[model samples]
Target: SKPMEVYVSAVASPTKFWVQLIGPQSKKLDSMVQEMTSYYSSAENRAKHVLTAPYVGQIVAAVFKFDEKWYRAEIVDIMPNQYNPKEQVIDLYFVDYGDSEYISPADICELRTDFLTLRFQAVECFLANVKSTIQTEPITWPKSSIAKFEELTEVAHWRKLIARVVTYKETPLPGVELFDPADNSELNIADLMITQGFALPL
Candidate 1:
């Protein structure tokens, strides 16, 4: 019965989703995101600061122009661009979203030192007591499994849910059991995934 209210901001797969707690941490994240957006919106600021020759594993801030937003990200890898050897290609893992993207070096900026004061908001976690089908060395989930999980949880919609930490281990991410607080049902997310054939019980 260990449960905390959370908002599921991003879903990576059936087994993994980014959970933002419904408390002070979430408030801080919103404030940070808002300030980051306003601070970086000035053309002068963006032009004045740019990341160049950033090494792998560096934490930085990136402008995701498609969404017209910015986020705190880490450099996952660096490689020479095929089209332009003078410019390098970089892979960015968004620290709070549990997602990654390949981007141009120009999109990155050195993160403001103060921004690092708060921990990353997104907590990457797996469903408690469940496994993807096939039970192989590296578990792979079907695309259908991901979609089902998204629909059940209303991910990215800022809907609050009860996340019960069913299993916590030092070596890996804690196992979570998620449920819609508004729903009157006996089953949690893991139960639904299993009963609907999206996943198997661990």
Candidate 2:
């Protein structure tokens, strides 16, 4: 009953990741995305509500213009361009997807009153009782190592997996154990990383 269904939204290492809730909530996210697609798809709607410069820490609807889809995102920061002072960039944290990106101000729009009712859905986590195998003083994970962790978590595909919180130490994020239910073998993510020489037991 404790385990929850989730999918990785971002993976920085075998030990650190961000995920979104699934199971019943997946339906909510799906419906939200579909609603946004229909509402924000119009060029007129986009132009009418575009934020010229959104404040940092404000939540807004951001559009991926190429894809023509808008998502519920929070403004993480407003970056001032060093060379071109007039061109300010916005940092967006896609709450539902657990990912972040840099986009121009023109790509952002004010969220409609109806869309503001749902709460943010991303959760940050750390793998319980495991440390990266890297020997660096500060434990910087290599890009290859991060990619391996991404592959292990299926971050690209956003496949549903099972997760259970195992510890809540000093860190703000809880320590969690995750596993792919589709695998026939009983291979949890932390143990699989250790077996693959990507990490060591704490």
Candidate 3:
């Protein structure tokens, strides 16, 4: 074997995952697991690992320092705090830049989405247009629609709402290799915008 394959028990643990250990990366995983302890842990075993956030290659917005800007980023990894279990941090990977950052769900607009990917410019343009739509046809929604988006209280709510809307405007672009959902929700921005006021979905 090029690298030892570690197959954690398929049924005896919280996860059925495996890893190919190679170099420092393998050593790093061990190190993280070592410095911890939990209820699911034993004294004989050094520490226990817990899934604090159910984040899986999802999306969030990343804040840029200048020009009051932000970009969508993927939440690549979520690890518990080494010492105190309550606190955790996230590793955000930027698609356009091929780089990543360590944050704790705290960035401008609080660096928040799914996994919404676009050409840097495409998302950037959408972000700008979203702001424009907000000004002329501001969409203020009650904290409902649990299926589409659950959190809707103040700006975080709108941030997600705008993101969902962007997902809308882009879905109809033919041959983008995008999946257009047939299922409908009362929360779709097209209706949200036109039903009361108007906002361009472009």
Candidate 3 regions off by >4 Å? 1-54, 64-69, 108-117, 120-202
lDDT of 2 at 183: 78
Ranking by lDDT: 1, 2, 3
Q: Which candidate comes out best when scored by lDDT?
A: 1
| Residue-level lDDT tens digits of model 1 in 29-135 | 88888888888888788776677658889999888889878889999999789999877888998887667888888778888889899898888888788778766
Total clashes in model 1, counting residue pairs 3 or more apart in sequence or in different chains: 0
Tens-digit per-residue lDDT, 1-202, candidate 3 = 1212221111111111111223454454334323321211332321221223446576554454442344455788877767667656678765433345666544412221222322331121121121123444444332232112211112111121212212323434211111113234544433443343443333
Question: Comparing 1 and 3 by lDDT, which wins?
Answer: 1
- In every candidate, how many clashes are there? 0, 0, 8
The per-prediction CA RMSD against the true structure, in angstroms, equals: 2.0, 2.1, 17.7
